[PDB]
């Protein structure tokens, strides 16, 4: 529901839940290869379900070099 | 699910046809690094290795893995003098070393030579990244030779290496690129144990390990061509798992050996390897000091004194 974006460079948006992570990433236009989504201490995969009460942190895997 | 234990996967890799839970991803990552090292003979068992550490996810993960693998891994951090980014990079790296009881060597660019990367982007005649790259490579090699390290390890990953290759093809050098570069006189060996790992995979390791790394990118990185290359390659990877690795492996094994003979000189100033009379590092500082004096940022009677290569 609440999605914290990286890098900070802080950015925070919000989306609807009860759908796979694959779906919410596509809405945000994020390439799954380039990010890691974290709920608490647990990493989420594309098939994993995000809730309507969930708080996610999406971290960029991409190094600017 | 996890391929090993059948429980819920923390990391799914479609490129490898492999999914793993936390415990078994951690083991696999360490073992794949060990396998990468053995295959290309990057390091000797228990050997002293200089790890170039930025505080970023890759180089901290590398320092972690090389320590776990029994190598004697000393970190080198270079404080590049880029604003708060460099300050935080140092702090994060010191914190990592402190917690794990690891030896960290530090070179402060501004403190040693008078000017950091931002000043170099004005005074050197080079753009920031150009001056920075040169400073990093030279100083890393210098510390290695001075402290008697045979080999240096950097945290370059698959996306990094694939991007460089793609860049080199888009703007034709090629033959110089490799995961293992041989030691020479005045030149430590250079190895990239993470070169087959995607950024996503290294980051997953770093997160699952609970490693505190600097999230912030350097401010000079935005709009870099490397980001464009990675974006294009990852566009392909998304719909064609394994493409990046086939791309880089294909080049290394097939194309590169058929691409290519002058001996490296010795710098008149510092004595370190160069193809010129005076190496690029020493020429940069001579130009910087000249320009600095004109702008009254440096005293006229101050002179650049290089640390000469020992023998
Ligand atoms: N300030 C620094 N001091 C020492 N080594 C560095 C420094 N910056 C980069 N390196 C070395 O060069 C490699 C490539 O750096 P690059 O700028 O591509 O990524 P990075 O910002 O260092 O993040 P990461 O540590 O995740 O690679 C790093 O993995 C590290 O080994
Ligand atoms: S981007 Fe990478 S290279 Fe360009 S300046 Fe910042 S750190 Fe040095
Ligand atoms: Zn498992
Ligand atoms: Zn020199």
Author numbering:
A (entry chain E): 1 to 65
B (entry chain B): 2 to 173, 177 to 264, 268 to 318
Please quote the paper that reports this structure.
TtuA transfers sulfur from sulfur donor TtuB to substrate tRNA by consuming ATP. TtuB is a ubiquitin-like protein with a molecular mass of ~7 kDa. Only three cysteine residues chelate the cluster, leaving one Fe atom (hereafter referred to as the unique Fe site) remaining free from coordination by TtuA.
The crystal structure of holo-TtuA in complex with TtuB-COOH and adenosine triphosphate (ATP) was successfully determined at 2.2 Å resolution. However, a new interaction directly coordinated between the unique Fe site of the [4Fe-4S] cluster and the C-terminus of TtuB was observed. Two oxygen atoms from TtuB and two sulfur atoms from the Fe-S cluster form the equatorial plane of the octahedron. On this axis, Lys137 of TtuA lies across the water molecule and forms a hydrogen bond with it.
